Design a protein around this ligand. Structure first.
Ligand SMILES: [Zn+2]
Lengths: 100, 125, 128, 654, 40, 201, 49
RNA sequence: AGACAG
DNA sequence: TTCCCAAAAGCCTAAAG
């Protein structure tokens, strides 16, 4: 099940459209491009919590505690895209972030 | 009519694992939680592994037991099933270059335990 | 073979306290039903209890009305019997002397119902 | 004016066309000069068996492939008008498939993979099954009270079930003989499902005999025969109490001999497979070795040599078949596993092994094949001891040359006797105290009339001694059959008493004993195949016959071959493989790998070989700490390879 | 002869032994029973 | 030396008495659904826009119930196992005594009847082990690779045709069963024609 | 022991009876271990062991 | 380690 | 529990400084 959830979370477009069909693909592409740089840093509990909240209609929440880091980064990108489309831009900003 | 009517069939694509990676038995609460039993059948006993080692080269039998014993090999098998256009007729299940032999948990435990005694079984040169 | 149909009686046991809470598998959005009533019929997919681990931080994810009805096969605990099997009876045991009730308000209707009936029965036995 | 058909043309017909042939008598013409008179159904079965010949259009079909090959068309009608046709059995159809596949194999220059032949054989069997199941939906077999009455009401069976002396000779040789004569007659019962199946091997004769004829002498939990037999079979009701109880004890014996004998037999099978798994490779070809094995072919062991090459006159190699009368009881120079200088350390050539290697699949472990064949045969024999128990004729005890010099037989079916030559000197019996514990009871009992002689003593070896002080020890027990002192000698011992010895052995003076009286009464107990399996185990792993006692394997093979073939029909190649697995080269120098070419080397016990050949193979056997904690295991000595090595490690080849 | 008590589970066995009477050897059964459990 | 394989099932052997192939096996609905869990998940994800969670939910929900979709997925999996009769697998009977105790088969069809927890191994391959339909459960291991299928091809039934104890004889394990032999007897050995002399005259 | 047919009152009387009267059961026994007559169907003595 | 199934 | 069977202990008898 964990391997399957990894291979699932490796895609974002399908999960995002499962949450909301009306999401532009440009936002998804921008979030993936930002993941390509952000994957180096660490993932912090607020990011995981927000991604679990936003993406449960397509991805189980508890799987976030079992899946690998790349899957978590892709799910963070998808959750940020969903927040950005919905209108909660402030929380969307706090998705792909580094500690300082 | 008799008992042993069936309903004890135990098909399991993948079985939950102990902290020391090996399939385990099903406890009552965790055995009454799946449609039909999800037991890991010991279809490779000593006699079965004898027949396999003799009829087929020991290579494929060791590969099967490595897929079962090493959790990483089983994860690779499931990944190959899921990430293929044809889940049936997968060309190679586990890429042995990416996952070398010798990672099986019982064999690693045996080798480490011997090394703690100061000995290790190795091939003759 | 229709003339030879064995009758099978089975018992399913589920514990829900501070560890986990029952989901909603036999009730709509309006009515919360964790398990079938007496004389009810199990779902076409035989599933009962399906208890989910209790986590507060995951409240807006696994406690929404859709998430309670939806069953995740992994990470949840269901007891799976024969589908279409009529329920004979239900036995309820409750520890009523815990000041913070672990089960959140709303998901204790049938539980309290059957526990009240059993409590009346045993109270009448004790009174006799 | 019979019909005419050609074998190749008829085989090429489609299944629908083949089954759409008229009910006729026709002459099948084969590619040789012989023609067979046959009916349509036998011909259709023959073609369905010939199916493997379809893929090879250039192989001639000889006249012996047809099921009804007994009839051959000739000028004189005296040889085919009235001839019984070949019976159609499952074994017969398998035999015809065998004939077809080996005709394909022999027609070419043997350049046909036997795996392909076996593939074609199963394909032919499957097509036969499918065509029979589809087309023969109305020619089923039926059983009811009418068939049992038809067999039962036969006057000769009724005579064979009346006026019978209740003895082994009068039941299991006379009445059963009459019933067999009734069943074996090809004219008495026609259209009867039971006897039609019996004539084709569907039902073994023993069960039908125990049903229609008298049930014969059931057995208790211990393998002893009750004196009073069962008067009634199974078709009639066994309504008495004695007979019901004794057959119930037979069922109990079946359950126990299943359970516990499996418990021991599977462990012995595991050990044998573990040891034989060292001999691995059978490489097709020939090693051109000059070393030959001088094996004596006897009547019983001839069938075991069914595949093996040997030197004939003018230095030519021929392989024994199922029928050689001239070679019976003569010493021949076979090409054995021993003395095969094949380059492989654990590999042997095809010629040295035998013809059986053709049936062996390509990439198979040959030692495992031998061990598995032995395990199958011994497990089946041990479990189905009850199958052979249908005859109450207890396996007679044989006397060796040394034993015959002191003991004789006669005047009684079971008990032995002392020869008059023992009157020449004052001989004296010596028995062990362990085997004689309840003997002194005869002293306390004042009337040895109702006292059972078997409970007094259970002997396996007797020392006859005379003053010089010489004498010899003789083995009297035959596996489970432990000889017991007779009532007459019990009375003599009571009259004379005995005396111990420094070796703690009871000593009895035979002076004044009335001779020509019973001595060493043998129990009416069947020999157990479990004891024979123990004998096999002791052999493989005052004079006994252990394998390590032999100098060269050439003189050691025939003993094991006869010992196995007494009860299990085991090929000589398997025996050679097992013995060669038992062998060791230069046991003095602590070298435990297989000798080459196969004779230059001694024997060794099982445990030393398992714990001193390869540690990977030692891990799967008992007491792993013994070879782990062994200095020799740390010495860089040349060693053999075992498959468990690759399992002992995770799979790393090097 | 196996006799059970509230505490013990005793067994009475027997063996043979030799003794000389009037100068001639004679054989008689000696009946024994292990009762001290620590003896084994 | 072997313990508790994954992708393994165990069930009572009830067979098919129909024109079939010896290398043909019929795994049932529940065994097919649980054993081919990830194959069905892959097919659902590939065809339908279903998340993996929805795929597992659908598969587990429809183990004790029948539907057309999962049956079609089984059929298409077995069809996509192209150069084989079906999905390669090994079948074990205990105790493992002979070569035929372990034999390769090819899965061909999940049974549409939910009440059939049965395994249609071929009639011919019954005698290689001591398998009789008296209520015995046998083991089934799904081969997850083509390399493992090719390796197991050496354990295929056609390997025990030739007797390992006779030079040129087919092993007695290939003999036809009781009912078929009795049918053949009642058909061939019948007096449906006059003797040869009377037939000629 | 009184029920069976022995008159033990002290363990030494038991040893005398075994050495003299019950010794008959050690070498040539009239009764047999194989039978099941003259046996009790005890329940309490094993439950309350 | 006891029963059951093969 | 009881039978198998090998490995270490232990014992009388015999050979060299
Ligand atoms: Zn050779």
């Amino acid at each position: 099940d964990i391997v399957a959830y990894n291979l699932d979370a490796l895609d974002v477009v399908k999960l995002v459209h499962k949450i909301d069909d009306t999401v532009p693909v440009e936002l998804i592409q921008e979030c993936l491009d930002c993941v390509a740089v952000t994957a180096t840093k660490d993932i912090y509990p607020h990011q995981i919590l927000l991604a679990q909240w936003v993406m449960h209609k397509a991805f189980p929440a508890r799987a976030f505690s079992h899946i690998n880091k790349n899957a978590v980064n892709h799910l963070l990108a998808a959750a940020q895209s969903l927040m950005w489309h919905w209108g909660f831009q402030q929380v969307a900003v706090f998705m792909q972030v580094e500690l300082y | 009519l008799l008992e042993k009517i069936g309903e004890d069939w135990s098909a399991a694509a993948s079985v939950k694992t102990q902290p020391f990676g090996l399939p385990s038995k099903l406890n009552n609460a965790d055995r009454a939680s799946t449609p039909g039993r999800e037991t890991a059948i010991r279809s490779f006993g000593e006699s079965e592994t004898r027949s396999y080692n003799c009829t087929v080269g020991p290579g494929p039998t060791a590969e099967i037991l490595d897929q079962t014993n090493n959790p990483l090999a089983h994860a690779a098998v499931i990944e190959s099933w899921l990430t293929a256009e044809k889940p049936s007729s997968v060309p190679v299940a586990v890429d042995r270059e990416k996952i070398p032999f010798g990672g099986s948990r019982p064999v690693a435990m045996f080798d480490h335990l011997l090394e703690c005694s100061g000995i290790a079984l190795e091939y003759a040169p | 073979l229709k003339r030879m149909m064995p009758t099978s009686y089975s018992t399913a046991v589920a514990n829900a306290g501070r560890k986990a809470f029952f989901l909603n598998m036999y009730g709509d959005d309006k009515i919360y039903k964790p398990f079938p009533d007496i004389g009810d019929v199990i779902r076409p997919d035989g599933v009962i209890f399906a208890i989910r681990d209790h986590d507060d931080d995951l409240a807006p994810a696994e406690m929404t009305p859709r998430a309670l009805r939806t069953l995740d096969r992994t990470f949840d605990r269901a007891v799976i019997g024969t589908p279409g099997a009529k329920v004979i009876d239900i036995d309820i045991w409750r520890d009523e002397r815990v000041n913070p009730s672990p089960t959140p308000t709303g998901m204790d209707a049938q539980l309290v119902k059957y526990h009240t009936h059993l409590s009346s029965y045993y109270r009448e036995l004790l009174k006799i | 004016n019979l019909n005419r058909y050609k074998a190749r043309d008829l085989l090429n017909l489609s299944y629908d066309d083949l089954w759409s042939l008229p009910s006729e008598w026709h002459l099948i013409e084969f590619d040789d000069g012989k023609t067979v008179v046959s009916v349509d159904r036998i011909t259709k079965l023959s073609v369905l068996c010939w199916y493997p010949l379809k893929h090879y259009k250039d192989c001639p079909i000889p006249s012996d492939h047809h099921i009804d090959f007994n009839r051959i068309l000739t000028d004189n009608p005296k040889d085919y008008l009235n001839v019984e046709g070949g019976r159609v059995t499952s074994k017969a159809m398998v035999k015809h498939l065998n004939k077809a596949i080996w005709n394909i194999y022999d027609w070419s220059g043997e350049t046909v993979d036997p795996e392909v032949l076996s593939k074609l054989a199963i394909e032919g069997k499957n097509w036969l099954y499918n065509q029979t199941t589809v087309k023969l939906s109305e020619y089923l077999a039926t059983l009811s009270m009418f068939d049992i009455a038809e067999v039962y009401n036969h006057p000769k069976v009724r005579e064979a079930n009346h006026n019978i002396e209740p003895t082994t000779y009068g039941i299991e040789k006379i009445s059963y003989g009459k019933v067999k004569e009734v069943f074996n007659d090809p004219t008495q019962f026609i259209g009867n499902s039971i006897i039609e199946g019996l004539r084709s091997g569907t039902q073994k004769t023993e069960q039908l005999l125990q049903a229609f004829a008298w049930r014969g002498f059931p057995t208790d939990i211990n393998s002893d025969i009750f004196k009073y037999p069962v008067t009634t079979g199974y078709i009639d009701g066994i309504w008495n109490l004695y007979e019901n109880m004794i057959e119930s004890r037979s069922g109990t014996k079946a359950l126990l001999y299943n359970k516990e004998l499996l418990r021991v037999t599977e462990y012995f099978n595991r050990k044998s497979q573990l040891i034989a798994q060292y001999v691995q490779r059978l490489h097709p070809g020939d090693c051109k070795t000059t070393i030959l094995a001088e094996y004596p072919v006897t009547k019983l062991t001839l069938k075991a040599f069914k595949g093996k090459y040997y030197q004939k006159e003018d230095g030519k190699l021929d392989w024994i078949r199922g029928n050689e009368t001239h070679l019976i009881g003569t010493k021949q120079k076979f090409r054995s596993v021993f003395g095969c200088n094949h380059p492989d350390s654990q590999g042997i050539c095809m010629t040295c092994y035998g013809r059986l290697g053709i049936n062996i699949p390509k990439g198979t472990n040959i030692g495992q094949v031998a061990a598995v064949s032995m395990g199958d045969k011994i497990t089946s024999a041990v479990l189905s001891t009850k199958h052979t128990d249908a005859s109450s004729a207890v396996e007679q005890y044989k006397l060796g040359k040394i034993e015959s010099n002191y003991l004789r037989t006669g005047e009684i079916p079971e008990t032995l006797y002392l020869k008059k030559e023992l009157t020449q000197k004052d001989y004296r019996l010596v028995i062990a105290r362990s085997e004689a514990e309840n003997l002194a009871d005869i002293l306390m009992i004042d009337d040895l009339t109702a006292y059972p002689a078997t409970s007094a003593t259970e002997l396996t070896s007797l020392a006859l001694v005379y003053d010089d002080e010489c004498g010899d020890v003789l083995t009297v027990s035959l596996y489970n059959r432990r000889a017991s002192l007779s009532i007459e000698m019990l009375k003599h011992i009571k009259m004379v008493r005995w005396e111990l010895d420094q070796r703690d052995n009871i000593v009895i003076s035979l002076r004044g004993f009335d001779f020509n009286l019973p001595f060493l009464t043998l129990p009416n107990k069947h020999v157990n195949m479990y004891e024979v399996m123990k004998r096999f185990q002791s052999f493989l792993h005052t004079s006994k016959t252990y394998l390590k006692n032999y100098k060269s394997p050439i003189e050691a093979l025939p003993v094991f071959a006869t010992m196995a073939n007494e009860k299990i029909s085991l090929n000589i190649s398997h025996c050679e493989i097992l013995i060669y697995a038992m062998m060791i080269r230069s046991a003095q120098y602590r070298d435990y790998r297989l000798p080459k070419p196969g004779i230059n080397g001694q024997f060794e016990k099982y445990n030393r070989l398992m714990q001193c050949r390869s540690l990977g193979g030692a891990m799967a056997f008992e007491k792993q700490h013994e070879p782990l904690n062994n200095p020799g295991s740390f010495l860089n000595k040349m060693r053999n390879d075992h498959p468990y090595d690759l399992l002992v490690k995770g799979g790393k080849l090097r | 002869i196996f006799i059970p008590f509230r505490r013990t589970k005793l067994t009475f066995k027997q063996t043979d032994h030799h003794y000389m009477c009037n100068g001639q050897r004679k054989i008689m059964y000696v009946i024994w029973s292990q009762i001290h459990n620590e003896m084994a | 030396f072997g313990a508790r394989l994954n992708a393994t099932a165990r069930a009572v052997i009830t067979s098919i008495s129909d024109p079939h192939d010896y290398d043909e096996l019929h795994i049932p609905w529940g065994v097919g659904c649980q054993l081919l869990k990830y194959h069905l998940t892959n097919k659902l994800k590939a065809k339908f826009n279903m998340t993996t969670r929805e795929a597992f939910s659908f598969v587990y929900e429809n183990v004790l119930q029948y539907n057309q979709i999962i049956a079609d997925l089984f059929k298409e999996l077995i069809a996509e196992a192209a150069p084989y009769k079906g999905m390669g697998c090994t079948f074990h009977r205990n105790p493992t005594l002979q070569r035929g105790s372990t034999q390769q088969f090819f899965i061909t069809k999940v049974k549409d009847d939910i009440n059939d927890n049965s395994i249609s191994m071929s009639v011919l391959c019954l005698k290689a082990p001591n398998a009789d339909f008296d209520g015995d459960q046998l083991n089934l291991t799904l081969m997850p690779d083509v390399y493992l299928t090719k390796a197991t091809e050496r354990i295929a039934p056609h390997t025990w045709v030739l007797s390992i104890d006779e030079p040129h004889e087919i092993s007695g394990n290939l003999e036809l069963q009781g009912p078929v032999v009795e049918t053949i007897i009642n058909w061939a050995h019948e007096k449906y024609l006059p003797p040869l002399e009377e037939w000629l005259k | 022991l009184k029920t069976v047919g022995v008159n033990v009152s002290t363990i030494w009387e038991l040893l005398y009876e075994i050495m003299t009267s019950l010794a008959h059961h050690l070498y040539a026994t009239d009764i047999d271990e194989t039978s099941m007559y003259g046996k009790r169907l005890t329940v309490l003595h094993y439950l309350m062991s």
